[PDB]
Amino acid sequence: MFENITAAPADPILGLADLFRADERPGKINLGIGVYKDETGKTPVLTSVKKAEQYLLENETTKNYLGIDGIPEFGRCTQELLFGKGSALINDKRARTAQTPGGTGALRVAADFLAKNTSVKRVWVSNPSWPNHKSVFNSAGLEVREYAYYDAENHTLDFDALINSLNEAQAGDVVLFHGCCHNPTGIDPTLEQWQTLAQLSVEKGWLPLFDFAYQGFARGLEEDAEGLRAFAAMHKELIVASSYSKNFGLYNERVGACTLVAADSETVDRAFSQMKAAIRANYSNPPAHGASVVATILSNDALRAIWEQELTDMRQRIQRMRQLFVNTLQEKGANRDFSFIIKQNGMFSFSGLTKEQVLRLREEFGVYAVASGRVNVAGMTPDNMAPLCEAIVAVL
Template identity: 60%
Template sequence: MIFSEVPQALADPILGLNDAFRADPRSDKVNLGVGIYKTEAGDTPVLDCVKQAEALLLQQESSKNYLGIDGVPAYNQAVLALLFGAEHTLCVNGRARAAQAPGGTGALRVAAEFIRNHTASRTVWISNPTWANHKNVFETAGLTVQEYRYYQAKDHSMDFAAMQADLAQAQPGDIVLLHGCCHNPTGIDPTQTQWQQIAQQCLQQQLVPLFDFAYQGFGAGIEEDAAGLRLMAETVPEMLIASSFSKNFGLYNERVGAVTLVAENRDTCERGFSQIKHTIRANYSNPPAHGALIVSTILHDETLRALWHSEVTQMRERIAAMRELFVASLSAAGVNQDFSFIARQNGMFSFSGLTTAQVARLRDEFGIYIVGSGRISVAGMTRENMPVICRAIAAVL
């Protein structure tokens, strides 16, 4: 009997919260935990560009044969173009290769195993705070996780000096995880000047950047949000990128992501990418087709691509409007504390500053579910649920 000794795993801090929300019988409950975009009606929509692409695929698809290990070729080309820009020299010179992966998490895991099994690197530096699953992904792959300070609680800002000081302790070859845009959970991103300084620090200390790029288009725009990543790619000789289309295409359950390798020359890239594929083969053999075919169909069709840009803009602008309304509604609910910083943050999340005890009261007394760290999914707010949320927060402050 070997299974009787297996201990109970702790509930996931985000998906476990989702389970608790579903089990809650209250009709006025609100889920602001998981990062899923909601419309003003509280729905998670299928984008129009996605529906049209799926209709085309239904007409054109002739086989359900296996994909190659690295997935849909047209999809991987589209990934590189979104990351670096069309006809970027990295791609022309063969220094960058992308492989389709099952979501951003799958891409991170492939990157982690590639690092652990095929390089001398053993340490990954992650921001404090960061996405709850980062540490789990890297440690499960056998890597050591260190943290660099990122957030300054007293004024709800980025502690850039502390970040630089902590990364100064990193050793050559260490991996530095960076959020490409819309930092999760703080919503605070480096300025372009700060990105330049981060890139120079990585270059000088021979650190290897690993970008988690899950929210392209949700910050300032599809092209604008890639600015830090592109600057880094022009500065350092090698890097890794884990990207995802769950949010900006609304393809949450299709698990559409990619792992991209950038190397110092074509030969090194080809050898490294062969090991990326070897890692994929040992994990899930090859990826599922449908989500990647949707994305590649949209990005290779001028009309559908323009529609996608429009729909991403609509989502981004609605989230920004909810940030402004959140700040105003907290004030209207009698909260004297200054929450204006929420309107300055980017992306789906706000790092509210609420304590663990306050978060627990919101859940237990009011049916408002947010992550224990105080991270709130602004993308789940609507004009209808906003008064309920803000009255509850006023009560626990």
């Protein structure tokens, strides 16, 4: 059976972790996977999640199976964060959410469901986007088309190329939007551009799918959700795949959400019964620990106040490193004016590095970055800033 199975290529993000964790150079620098590192190069487990964990340890009676859609407290809290505390989709019982294993598990559940219960055939993803988007959707059986997104010469969103790309997307197609902190570019729509995108979706019939993985990482929690809420106020139907991996520091526990909205309580509940069928045929019900840590912090006034201090401290430190990377690059010899990376938000800088500059940087200098040139700014600390800036300019 298995003798003509060729080896798969390594994943572009996760394969980096494979090779880093084998590199014996004392001074290697990771810059690759999207994990926050603190001042000391550690990705600590947050204190609000460690306090919630103490809680769960004392106050937990059973490990008995969670329902297919998981914890309803979780589902409620997530809807509040996404849509507003007191929103109309909440109040009209228009949204329904299932707890999934990460934003990836959410994005697959959406795909499986759309593939089996819907007429949709195409999903439109930004050029460039998170590399694994293509792979989740082709796995569902859907095909992925790309719409122009980022103008490299000026280092901006190219809103006209993005409009004109999508004008050959049909009514009935999915168009995946990045909630905030675009991966890889870090460039997001202005709210004024999001409401333009929102009425254009409506006039043209595209179903929106929001990948929301970095909420709290751009401006703030609520501020970050404005584009989705400009779209939610106009769309009768949309699906959002939420992740709590990043903003809660809960990467290996796999906590995310798939929230489905339809025109009314009945339609959404009918559609969610097929989402639950898709979840039962994949993994049967969701992993509880991650999600109940989220539900506990979001449900306690005090433990919540500790968490969003921790989240703003993470958002600030990266802003300080972003500053630092472009200053230190200037005095270290940089051929270019990298003053555009200060403009991008979230954990990542999309520099203009070529695939060969990136490959050279891991082979002689051992600083690991993704082949598109995406470097993780959250991975930069004041101790590694100088050796790294030096590596970049020697390859430049």
